[PDB]
Design a protein around this ligand. Structure first.
Ligand SMILES: Nc1ncnc2c1ncn2[C@@H]1O[C@H](COP(=O)(O)O)[C@@H](O)[C@H]1O
Ligand SMILES: [Mg+2]
Length: 322
């Protein structure tokens, strides 16, 4: 019971254009259910809440005082945030809050902080300083000044929770688009795989260099010009090195991580970005079922072993290589 033209709703949340599309005859009401679940989770987890009413806003408030009871969503997301900090090359840390709050890249008051300000917040970054109580469902930051930032895994977790709300309503065929996070469920009604736009990391969001046939997967796109600060004609993107305080700078311009779960595409993005085109390709080769497309600063495109010869390059300004 598939339609060719889907039920579709677009909003604009978290400063990003969100679109949900369901190709299932009769399942129109599931659009408002998906969006309700996005707005409910986004309100629980955000650290950009100017009112400071979030569950994370409260943990950050009681840093070095007392633990904070949290809902299951927040407790689960933080638990996964800590695990992704273990796997990394010391590259990923949900306690990067104080550094990300200082730069505040992509906000109206985005600035390049002085070296002295950056040196002040670095020693406060340690995921091992986050103690969770299971029997209490409390999260505690052990030292004053620590802050949580879940921005790196927030959209991935939300996309997976949107996908689960979808299948509880027996949706079979859908597209979830949360800016740089895309989930394609089932197939194009016409029977072919979904054609996923692989973002041009040198153009506004939606400009693509090529399509990638996928079905039942997440594509999480990162780029050096997605949300960036330009001070004195020098660019600073949002993926920061917790051990230096500055953005990661290598040959990578864009990466799209193809995974089963969108939270994993978000979760491995930082460590993958941190290691460079070739060091990051090898990092992806250690994850079964995870693959990636890298786009170098010289506009050369690289596939991981599981995606070789599958990506269809359609911008002639870009070339394929090994
Ligand atoms: N090294 C990091 N570890 C954890 N979270 C980070 C890190 N760098 C940036 N973030 C947060 O995650 C966002 C970038 O995630 P993404 O666009 O998925 O690469 C930033 O806006 C910060 O809120
Ligand atoms: Mg991320």
């Amino acid at each position: 019971k598939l339609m060719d033209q889907p039920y579709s709703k677009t909003d604009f949340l978290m400063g990003t254009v969100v679109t949900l599309k369901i190709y299932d005859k009769g399942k129109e009401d599931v659009l408002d259910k998906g969006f309700d679940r996005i707005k409910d989770l986004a309100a629980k987890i955000t650290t950009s809440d100017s009112e400071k009413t979030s569950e994370v806003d409260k943990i950050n408030e009681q840093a070095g005082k007392k633990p904070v009871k949290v809902s299951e969503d927040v407790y689960y997301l933080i638990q996964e945030g800590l695990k992704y900090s273990e796997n990394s090359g010391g590259s990923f840390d949900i306690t990067i809050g104080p550094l990300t709050s200082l730069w505040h890249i992509g906000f109206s008051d985005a600035r390049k902080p002085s070296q002295a300000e950056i040196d002040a917040v670095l020693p406060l970054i340690n995921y091992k300083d986050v103690k969770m109580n299971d029997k209490d469902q409390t999260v505690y930051l052990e030292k004053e000044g620590m802050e949580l930032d879940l921005g790196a895994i927030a959209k991935g977790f939300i996309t997976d929770e949107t996908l689960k709300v979808f299948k509880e309503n027996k949706v079979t065929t859908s597209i979830i688009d949360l800016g740089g996070n895309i989930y394609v469920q089932g197939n194009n009604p016409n029977g072919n795989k979904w054609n996923v736009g692989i973002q041009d990391p040198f153009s506004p969001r939606g400009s693509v260099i090529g399509k990638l046939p996928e079905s039942n997967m997440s594509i999480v796109t990162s780029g050096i010009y997605e949300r960036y600060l330009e001070v004195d004609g020098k660019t600073y993107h949002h993926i920061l090195d917790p051990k230096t305080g500055y953005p990661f700078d290598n040959d990578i311009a864009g990466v799209s991580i193809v995974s089963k779960k969108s939270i994993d595409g978000d979760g491995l993005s930082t460590a993958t970005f941190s290691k460079g085109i070739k060091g990051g390709m090898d990092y992806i080769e250690q994850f079964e079922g995870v693959d990636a497309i890298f786009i170098s600063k010289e506009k050369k495109v690289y596939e991981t072993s599981g995606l070789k010869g599958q990506f269809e390059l359609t911008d002639k300004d870009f070339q394929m290589d090994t």
